[PDB]
Design a protein around this ligand. Structure first.
Ligand SMILES: Nc1ccn([C@@H]2O[C@H](COP(=O)(O)CP(=O)(O)OP(=O)(O)O)[C@@H](O)[C@H]2O)c(=O)n1
Ligand SMILES: [Cl-]
Ligand SMILES: [Cl-]
Ligand SMILES: [Cl-]
Ligand SMILES: [Cl-]
Ligand SMILES: [Mg+2]
Ligand SMILES: [Mg+2]
Ligand code: NA
Length: 328
DNA sequence: CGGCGTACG
DNA sequence: CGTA
DNA sequence: GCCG
């Protein structure tokens, strides 16, 4: 079992679901307390279990697995012995965990804001709604639409949405393309949002594209919220049709030049942990700096000109993983 | 012990 | 600060 | 919290 998640295939569904869920609760709780190192270890340990070929049934099967030390091993041991881990259950039922989870789930609220509200004594969404002068416009939209945004986006919703985006994109810039990325490209059947990557086959034509796209979507009445109602990423709330009505859904749009498209596609297809691990691997094992724009050799001061995701994996000395195996 | 991904709005 |  |  290699130490980096980008070195091993991780499928969407696996053989250790309950164990990984429990470790991800501890990871999440670590993040709510600002303990980024512990969050990473618990996320990595959970991801190792997702990559195993069969269920863990005995503690000895953790021997030699990376990212399993005394703490994560004890969590697994208790789950194996009793079906429950006391530390995990104590987190689950704690007021701090439940409120931080509720608040950070709001679009426009991060850990730092949630924590401040928590220390001010706030606990429920209706607490926040009662003091709306404390809220940014982004947070007001996230709170108003919170109920719809808490319901999963279905993969069967995505194609109709993509067609609507493609219509606006084609009027903004004929020939520009829309590619589904994020969790749905990794094979998820449901998601929290839809992530689209936009480009154009003629380098430079994509300059200034996203404002034109957003203005067209807003003119069609489809945008319930966006930040601009020059930029290259938009985080918006979209009106999605429903039987006799509609629902709010989160849609992310990003524009990249076609020269960068492999890097952007890789960078936006995820998972989030896979990307963190891939960039850590690149820098720490290969001495190369990776982001969603490119891959930089700081000694030569040169950028690698990739034509595909396959190119990028090869340049990093990694076996290619299709999106479905990037579910770290 | 240091390090923990890297951007954009 | 928020967002991916 | 864990790895190198
Ligand atoms: N911090 C981050 C957050 C996001 N990303 C990248 O952005 C993509 C969409 O994130 P996203 O937030 O839409 C989560 P997704 O994987 O699509 O599943 P979901 O929407 O059903 O929950 C991820 O797959 C990563 O490639 C990242 O590199 N670093
Ligand atoms: Cl920490
Ligand atoms: Cl409607
Ligand atoms: Cl590609
Ligand atoms: Cl980036
Ligand atoms: Mg997504
Ligand atoms: Mg997204
Ligand atoms: Na949030």
């Amino acid at each position: 079992m290699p130490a980096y998640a980008c070195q091993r295939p991780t499928p969407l569904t696996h053989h250790n679901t309950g164990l990984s869920e429990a470790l991800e609760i501890l990871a999440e709780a670590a993040g709510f307390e600002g303990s980024e190192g512990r969050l990473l270890t618990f996320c990595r340990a959970a991801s190792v279990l997702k990559a195993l070929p069969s269920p863990v049934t005995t503690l000895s099967q953790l021997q030699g697995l990376p990212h399993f030390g005394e703490h994560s091993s004890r969590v697994v041991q208790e789950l194996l012995e009793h079906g429950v881990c006391e530390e995990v259950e104590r987190v689950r039922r704690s007021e701090r965990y439940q409120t931080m989870k509720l608040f950070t789930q709001i679009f426009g609220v991060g850990v730092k804001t949630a924590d401040r509200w928590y220390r001010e004594g706030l606990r429920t969404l209706d607490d926040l709604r009662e003091q709306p002068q404390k809220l940014t416009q982004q947070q007001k939209a996230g709170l108003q639409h919170h109920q719809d945004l808490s319901t999963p986006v279905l993969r069967s919703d995505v194609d109709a949405l993509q067609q609507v985006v493609e219509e606006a994109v084609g009027q903004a810039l004929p020939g520009a393309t829309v590619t589904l990325t994020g969790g749905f490209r990794r094979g998820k059947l449901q998601g929290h949002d839809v992530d689209f990557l936009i480009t154009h086959p003629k380098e430079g034509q994509e300059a200034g594209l996203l404002p034109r796209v957003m203005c067209r979507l807003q003119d069609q009445g489809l945008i319930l919220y966006h930040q601009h109602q020059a930029f290259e990423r938009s985080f918006c709330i979209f009106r999605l049709p429903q039987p006799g009505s509609w629902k709010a859904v989160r849609v992310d749009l990003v524009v990249a030049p076609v020269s960068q498209f492999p890097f952007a596609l890789l960078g936006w297809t995820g998972s989030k942990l896979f990307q963190r691990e891939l960039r850590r691997f690149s820098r720490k094992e290969k001495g190369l700096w990776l982001n969603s724009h490119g891959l930089f050799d700081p000694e030569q001061k040169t950028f690698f000109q990739a034509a595909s995701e396959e190119d990028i994996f090869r340049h990093l000395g990694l076996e290619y993983l299709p999106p479905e195996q990037r579910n770290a």
